[PDB]
Amino acid sequence: HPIDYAFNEYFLQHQLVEPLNNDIIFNYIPERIRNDVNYILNMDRNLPS
Amino acid sequence: FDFRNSMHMLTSNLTFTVYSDLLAFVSADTVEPINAVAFDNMRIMNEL
Amino acid sequence: LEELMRTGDYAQITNMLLNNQPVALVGALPFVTDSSVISLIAKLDATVF
Numbered sequence: 282h283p284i285d286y287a288f289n290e291y292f293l294q295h296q297l298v299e300p301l302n303n304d305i306i307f308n309y310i311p312e313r314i315r316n317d318v319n320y321i322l323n324m325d326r327n328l329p330s
Numbered sequence: 331f332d333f334r335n336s337m338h339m340l341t342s343n344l345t346f347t348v349y350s351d352l353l354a355f356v357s358a359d360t361v362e363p364i365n366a367v368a369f370d371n372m373r374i375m376n377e378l
Numbered sequence: 379l380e381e382l383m384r385t386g387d388y389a390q391i392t393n394m395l396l397n398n399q400p401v402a403l404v405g406a407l408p409f410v411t412d413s414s415v416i417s418l419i420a421k422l423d424a425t426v427f
Contacts, residue, residue, distance in 0.1 A: 282336050283335070283336070286338045293340075293341060293342060296343070298346065298348070301349070306352065306353075306355055306356065309352065309353075318361075318367060318385070318386070319360070319361050319365075319366055319367060320358065320360060320361075320386075321358050321359045321360060321361070321386040321387075322356070322357075322358055323357040323358065323389065324355070324357065325355070325357045326355045329347065359386065360386075361384070361385075361386050362384075365384060
């Protein structure tokens with residue numbers, strides 16, 4: 282219905298869901314620490330598109 | 331009620347997989363305490 | 379190696395091994411003697427690593 286399409290529509294055009302790369306995980310990390318030798322970082326699980 | 335004016339087409343994505351918490355995928359160990367270093371780099375706790 | 383298991387390995391080695399590049403290692407090590415020529419031709423020693 283006009284008013285219904287109205288709704289559900291925007292719900293689609295606002296799917297607050299961004300992608301995700303190993304890189305982003307790495308990044309949700311303080312610019313520091315990574316640059317603090319004392320601590321070890323590494324990847325193990327893969328990432329599906 | 332007029333049909334054609336009510337019928338719409340749908341742009342929907344297909345098969346995600348939502349992840350929460352996150353982090354976890356972070357494999358991380360740690361040096362042995364006796365080997366600490368500050369921004370300094372010479373070593374923290376160096377009085378043997 | 380001493381400065382490795384200390385430094386927490388900077389995936390430096392991890393990369394070189396992965397990418398297959400001519401390199402060496404140093405320090406205390408466990409040798410292992412084998413005979414039956416065979417082993418050699420099969421180029422067994424490329425394993426372990």
